[PDB]
Amino acid sequence: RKLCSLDNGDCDQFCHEEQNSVVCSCARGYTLADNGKACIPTGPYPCGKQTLER
Amino acid sequence: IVGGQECKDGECPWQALLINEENEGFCGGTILSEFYILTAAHCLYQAKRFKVRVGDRNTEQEEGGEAVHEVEVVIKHNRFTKETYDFDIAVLRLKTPITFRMNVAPACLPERDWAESTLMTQKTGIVSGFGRTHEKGRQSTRLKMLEVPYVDRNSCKLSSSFIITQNMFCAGYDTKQEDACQGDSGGPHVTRFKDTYFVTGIVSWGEGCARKGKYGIYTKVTAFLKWIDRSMKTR
Amino acid sequence: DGDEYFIGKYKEKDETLFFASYGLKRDPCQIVLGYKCSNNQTHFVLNFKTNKKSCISAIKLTSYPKINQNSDLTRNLYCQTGGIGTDNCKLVFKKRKRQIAANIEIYGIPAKKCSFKDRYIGADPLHVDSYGLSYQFDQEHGWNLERNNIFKDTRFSTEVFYHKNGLFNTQITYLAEEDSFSEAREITAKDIKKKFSIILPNEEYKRISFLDVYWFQETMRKKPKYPYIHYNGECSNENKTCELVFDTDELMTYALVKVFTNPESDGSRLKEEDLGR
């Protein structure tokens, strides 16, 4: 994965190239996890998804 | 919005309506944050005063859960011209912090570089609203949604006979009766990426409705993000 | 002298249905010829229903004494259930504090062979409309302007609805210099439904370039509900027979369409600020 242009650079949220290296970055209500692919929610109603309760 | 299919509950939660003194909607808006509303510039002129309504799946009658809020201040781009319909972006600061619940949730604004690299290079996108059901017919009382693909730049400019600015881009079918009509001013356009939803454009303009060999023009939001950012801390 | 209010147009070969004079302060009315009224502080309504086979043509009201107010910017006479062409309608008039008399007359014509096309079409259809005001264009684009000295109303942006002497109006599109007049079509009251349509020809040099509709109707309250007159599908060159479809919320009683023809029209013509949602 040289650039984030290929499948979001394996990230499930924001991606960019820092020091010519693919690095992820999350949106509000999220933070980068151990693997960094998926950002775990950190809020009651995180954005980016449709609500599903009942 | 002609044709398509009615939005199912829990799939279109980022919408909001603008109501006049008679309490009838005429423009839409996107819930960007707890105080922030995105709307087209031209919606600010036909109404002297207005309020915001949220959480209504049926404009004809109340069903419970709807909320009414009062506007505080409006900000508009300094280069808006009524002739070319350019810079059709407007931000609204509200008063009461909206209470998030089911069917009421904001859509996060994505970064510009990703959006131009991947999001805008995808196949299709989703629009929604309360658009009229014909060229001059009646307005629908049920929120509706529809799907539309993108169009290449060369055909985009060759389609219409008017001038096209770099701040807005076209899309739409060729002959099938799938296109949004009047009454959807300020409506949001969203893109899907691994089930994640990102706002990309606003329904800006376009002559006629479902005309043969004609495309609709949507305002390109990705090039205004810094402006949007400079409005994140205004009042 | 006294002020006057009209509904319809008068012709020199019509017989009177009835003719009466009313005071406007008594309570209740005087029952004239077994009819019914109602009088209040700000309303005067009358019920009419003829017995002979006839279709009504015109109504006229005269009020004394003269008062300082023009009589064309608002609505003062309107009848609520019926109209022109149907043998009955219920008149409603709104008074002021200084009006104390009224004179009322009604004219009609034999029911079977009565049609109103010979009056509202005029003698020079290419230069004067049914209202009487002549057309006047813009010299740099050749598109007609909007007459401004009549009661006009809008529903949303980019819409117009004129009114005068109980006759409405709606112009479909814009008009050019070199248009021609082809013909006119009329629709009587026995072919009126809640939803209907009409077929017109578009063969070669009969290309439709302008349509304006004139119609009477009823109104429950002073605020009317204009019907939806949209243009079914698209009338391009290919489809020769083109249909016009109505969608009414209240029942009309008469309609009239003045087709205009221009071979040069490409089918699309719109202003530079009308176009975007």
Ligand SMILES: *[C@@H]1O[C@H](CO)[C@@H](O[C@@H]2O[C@H](CO)[C@@H](O[C@@H]3O[C@H](CO)[C@@H](O)[C@H](O)[C@@H]3O)[C@H](O)[C@H]2NC(C)=O)[C@H](O)[C@H]1NC(C)=O
């Ligand atoms: C003096 O009399 C006039 C009529 O001669 C009154 O105007 C009419 O009043 C009636 C009764 O309120 C109205 O009917 C109402 O209409 C609603 C509309 O939804 C409907 O639910 C019912 O049919 C209801 O009865 C009527 O609209 C109104 N206007 C007319 C007939 O043109 C007037 O109100 C009277 N004056 C006073 C001070 O009451």
Ligand SMILES: *[C@@H]1O[C@H](CO)[C@@H](O)[C@H](O)[C@H]1NC(C)=O
């Ligand atoms: C235009 O042609 C199409 C062809 O299918 C037809 O369905 C439509 O009714 C036509 N419209 C008019 C106004 O004639």
